[PDB]
A = this chain, B = another copy of it.
Amino acid sequence: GPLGSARRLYVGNIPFGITEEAMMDFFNAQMRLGGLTQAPGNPVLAVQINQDKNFAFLEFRSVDETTQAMAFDGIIFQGQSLKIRRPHDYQPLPGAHKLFIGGLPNYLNDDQVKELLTSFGPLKAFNLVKDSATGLSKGYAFCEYVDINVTDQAIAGLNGMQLGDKKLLVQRAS
């Protein structure tokens, strides 16, 4: 990062003995049949396989086609459900998935509020808004998860839900 790894994807649980050629042919055919290709020709340019640990990396011709291909997570290939993920070194830009948390009791401190949020997964940023003159909470906070796929799980699990006599609001910041 910040701009590395934008045209590669991790593929796990690949079928044993599968060749780089056959995997490339499979993925290129699915892109066409599923309507995910954005131009004539093949979106996947190359495949690299680690046979010992049963995983591959796909290399795409474009940034947007790499993003679209994530919709194939779970697809069954020769009896195996494939695990499709971003590369470890891929990171979205800072603040891309920032969340606003509203309707918190104002007597709770930072760590007590962080407890509710980290139950869904680790955070890479957090701030509980306070009155700087007195140090007292204003009842709302901002955060961002390390895994951006947890963002929607947190929204689903906490938005519109009861917390005391208050209802929580959890939504994307803006």
Interfacial residues, chain A to chain B (CB-CB below 8 A): 1, 3, 15-17, 52-54, 63, 79-80, 93-95, 98, 127, 129, 142, 174
Instruction: Please classify the interface of chain A as helix (H, G, I), strand (E, B), loop, or mixed, using the class held by over half of its residues.
Output: loop
Supply 10 A–B pairs (Cβ within 8 Å), ascending by A.
A1-B16, A1-B17, A16-B95, A16-B98, A17-B63, A52-B127, A53-B129, A54-B142, A79-B93, A80-B174
Task: Give A142 Cβ to nearest chain B Cβ, in Å.
Answer: 8
Measured in the bound complex, the distance between the Cα atoms of B156 and A10 in whole Å is: 34
Q: A16-B94, A16-B98, A79-B93 are in contact. List 11 more A-B contacts (CB 8 A).
A: A1-B16, A1-B17, A3-B16, A15-B95, A16-B95, A17-B63, A17-B94, A53-B127, A53-B129, A54-B142, A80-B174
Most-contacted residue by chain B among A16, A80, A98 (CB, 10 A): A16
